[PDB]
A paper describes a structure:
Then the mature Mpro forms a functional homodimer and transcleaves pp1a and pp1ab. Given its essential role in the viral life cycle and the absence of closely related homologs in the human genome, Mpro is considered an attractive target for anti-[name] drug development (12–14).
Substrate selectivity is revealed using structures of the [name] mutant in complex with six individual native cleavage substrates. We demonstrate that the subpockets (S1, S1′, S2, and S4) which are endowed with an exceptional selectivity are important for selective and potent binding.
Author numbering:
A (entry chain A), B (entry chain A): 1 to 302
C (entry chain C), D (entry chain C): 301 to 310
Write the structure that this text describes.
Amino acid sequence: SGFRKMAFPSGKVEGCMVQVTCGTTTLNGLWLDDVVYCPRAVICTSEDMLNPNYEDLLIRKSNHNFLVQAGNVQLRVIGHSMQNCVLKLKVDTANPKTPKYKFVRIQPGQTFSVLACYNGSPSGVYQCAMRPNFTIKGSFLNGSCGSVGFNIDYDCVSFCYMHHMELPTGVHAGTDLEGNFYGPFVDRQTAQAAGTDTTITVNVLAWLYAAVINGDRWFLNRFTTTLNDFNLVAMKYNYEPLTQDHVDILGPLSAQTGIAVLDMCASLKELLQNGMNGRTILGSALLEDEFTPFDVVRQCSG
Amino acid sequence: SGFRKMAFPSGKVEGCMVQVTCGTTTLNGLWLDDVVYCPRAVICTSEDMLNPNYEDLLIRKSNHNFLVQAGNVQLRVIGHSMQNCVLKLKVDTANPKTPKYKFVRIQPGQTFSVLACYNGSPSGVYQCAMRPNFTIKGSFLNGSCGSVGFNIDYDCVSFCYMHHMELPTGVHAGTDLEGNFYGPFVDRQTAQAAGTDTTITVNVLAWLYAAVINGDRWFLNRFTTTLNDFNLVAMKYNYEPLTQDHVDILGPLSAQTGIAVLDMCASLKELLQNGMNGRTILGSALLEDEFTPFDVVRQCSG
Amino acid sequence: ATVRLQAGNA
Amino acid sequence: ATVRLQAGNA
């Protein structure tokens, strides 16, 4: 029993974290086989960062301008190239700790584990969702650039996020591992803002199922609703429209609990209209939307 | 910026997790140097668990009754003994991945990372507080017995918790690593209940400081209060009394933010009396008490 | 209700 | 206000 924001065990990723330094700028890199991946912002000085021309800055660098350190060992860079917003630094040593891995791009609404890192040294692990507006509500300080986000399936690490920057609202933006940003952002220190965000409806419903599996059922009711009628309420409260595919993905949880999805939708409708009246659900006083159906099934009893 | 429930990187502990099987019972063990530590409940069958006599059950076992598996490798048990509620299984191989470590017992109100495990295989990591009533609000299913909780300081793992069991209320109980239970519990499947819990006041105040460091300051006010007058309100709302030592530990955070502790106490008093009126603090609609002052300082900007 | 010792089945 | 690229100082 119990329900916690749970991250994947970080060990396989810890073995891949290195430090990359160019000039007086340092950040984290990801060392897989004989390549170190890192944000191209590492070739920027403070003055470059307002309006960097990265191809210009890069052509003025040589391999030996890149100091890569893995623990006590300096790695010799033997080649470098830029792919979108990341650098690929070819090194002369293949990482003996390289896990089975994939570079995947995730969808808004999906979750992943973040290994926060500083100077190539892992400092903490926590779970994040990709927000509908392609930001993440992370916990990152200066030096965190290059920390990665990932999921683990069997023994394969699917890397999905490399951290770059913090927006003025305090939220975070980054790229997939081929250096393509999530959302309409660029790696320069300019005024940028995210689109308006929305709440991830299918995830809230998954979390309501988790609560029932865990014995919170005060919010249930005898009512039902149609998909169309629920989506009318969702738009009022800035929730995402619910689709038949979301109803389908919720199938297993609805079968485990005996609560029809549209019945749980009616429960959610009342919560949105009434609030909670001083009660809690799985220890929260608000509707949690950063657990996917998969997260719920993975963690909850069958 | 940002504030998340952050666990320690779990890699050093992942390298220590093994599976221990005795008969048809299996659970997790912790392999350090040439010793595997695990809950003594592993020598129990279903029928033994209501009223086990563990010294009796143990004397009927030999070394070869204990199957210890580390990944693909079976470890040969060459000695066994019981210390309080854990077993120490001496094996013929020292764990080459043994980190620097300590066995520490923690205090109620302190936090630690849990590596949830099943069949010796790590499955997730999350942060927990030891509740004032010596339970933890964890996330554990059958097979989790023997999962450990820990903190990491520099490169030394201070193990503080081994998981044993779940109480009827859905909360969790276990031992330190010399097998002494936290709280008034025993390792048998009987009706047991925890003492009444209370909220960890110093931690709530630490979390309020985190919020100010992160720009939530709507809850501040021009008022102050005395320690004695605050503790009067705390007792009404089932919060722990605040001491001068807690005020002292909050010193660094109060100096960083310019908000006197007793001024923050007055802010907390109003929150307790007024509720939040539909606002949130660091993304929560209730007062969070599972972050210590140390957790706040570690994670927040200086 | 009773405490559950959360071992697993081999 | 502007975006902050969160690299560190060597």
